[PDB]
Amino acid sequence: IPINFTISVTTEILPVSMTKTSVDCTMYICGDSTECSNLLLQYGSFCTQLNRALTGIAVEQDKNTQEVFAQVKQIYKTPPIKDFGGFNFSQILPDPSKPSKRSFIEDLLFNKVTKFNGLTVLPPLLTDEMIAQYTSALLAGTITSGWTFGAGAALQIPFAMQMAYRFNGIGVTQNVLYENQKLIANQFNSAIGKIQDSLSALGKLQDVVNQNAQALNTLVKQLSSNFGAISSVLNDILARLDPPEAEVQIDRLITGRLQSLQTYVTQQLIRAAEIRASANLAATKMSECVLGQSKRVDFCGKGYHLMSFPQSAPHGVVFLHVTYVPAQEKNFTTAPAICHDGKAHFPREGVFVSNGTHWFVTQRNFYEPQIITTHNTFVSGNCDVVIGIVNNTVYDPLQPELD
């Protein structure tokens, strides 16, 4: 049975969206050569198909962020009074002193992270200020209104009672929090400081940017390829050749570059599917971990879960899990049940523990012996069917009333 416990903070990062791109099919394949466009028009609707596919990727990009970061219609602002029940929240909350609306962890993350060929790039619909505002609103909501604001109107609750409920949901009585709240506050502050120092890495974010950069660079480098023709420059081929028989080189170049576009578009579609799946998973995590307490094991962090904390990141989101874990161990002797007067007893919710001196009952996650009463247990059946049992009396609080 545990005797002590430490509160920890763990991190996990999930990608949300990539950098939308857009490549014009016709202007890439042929430059100012009008006749190069004319010969392309024989092939038909390939350019239209490619353009439509890339536009679909572009719109899905904004769809992801709209899905994962828009869960509150009321922008909740933290009250000016800080120090919520002895917990120091100064690194996460955005300080008005900073010009940029980020806070310390956002700034650290954001600093840590590193057209004649139709490589047009479009901006996202939401600016970093907007996502920072979403993060601040969600943080304030879950830090002041508990969990009962993703289900309806926000209700103000002191932080201490909020955490007290959160303990009640994991299998421990309210006594532990109010008995040692200064200790839990010190441990939480130390953990936040430790995680702040740790990032001072982001392996799951630099990967996708590098992937897109590599793909685009391969496209651009493919231009210099001759593709089994006289040369590579369209203007150069135009000058030294004749329209009656220019069809050979132009046709070969068209085929080669079109095939390259086909490969690139297929790769982009695959990557988009993967990214959108990741974003959907992140949205589920936001709905479960943040606006509530989930009993699913090792999903909202590691170990017993208490409460989460979201953040912001370039093309991504950073989560902060607050868990609860047993610390020390102490062996004890157990018994399946206890017999008092030929009647079998069973514990209500805890377990029977025998120090050796006497017998006691305590819950399953925090040692706290109690005198064996008739209210912490109940009776059923005889004592002749249970495998293991020991002889011991059961106290009755009715005796003092007999005076």
């Binding site: 009321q74 922008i75 009250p79 004649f116 479009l122 619909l125």
Partner: protein, 115 residues
């Protein structure tokens, strides 16, 4: 003269014998926002990647033509980019604004109060 892409971008004139720069001139894409055929007919063209050089309203998403700019906050209806959304509100014409986010309201939060 070449670049990272090994493309010609700097030339020497055999007469003047000087360093000459080459910059791209072909660029542009058209996006058309409409309030709907049923509603009205006024439109507001948008250029994706050009400086307002060629009622204009410069945004980081490009150069916008044919829309009035206001500071009045409104819920976002149609997207353009960089937190700019258009609409057909006043007579009625095409307008642009910074995106709005719902409404603002804090909570009581007394250290001994409940709801």
């Amino acid at each position: 003269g070449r670049d990272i892409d090994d493309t010609t971008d700097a030339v020497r004139d055999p007469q003047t014998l000087e360093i000459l720069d080459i910059t791209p001139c072909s660029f542009g894409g058209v996006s058309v926002i409409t309030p709907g055929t049923n509603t009205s007919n006024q439109v507001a063209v948008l250029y994706q990647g050009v400086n307002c050089t060629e009622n204009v309203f410069q945004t980081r998403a490009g150069c916008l033509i044919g829309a009035e700019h206001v500071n009045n906050s409104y819920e976002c209806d149609i997207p353009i980019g960089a937190g700019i959304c258009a609409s057909y509100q006043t007579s009625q014409s095409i307008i642009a604004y910074t995106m709005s986010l719902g409404a603002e309201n804090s909570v009581a939060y007394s250290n001994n109060s409940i709801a």
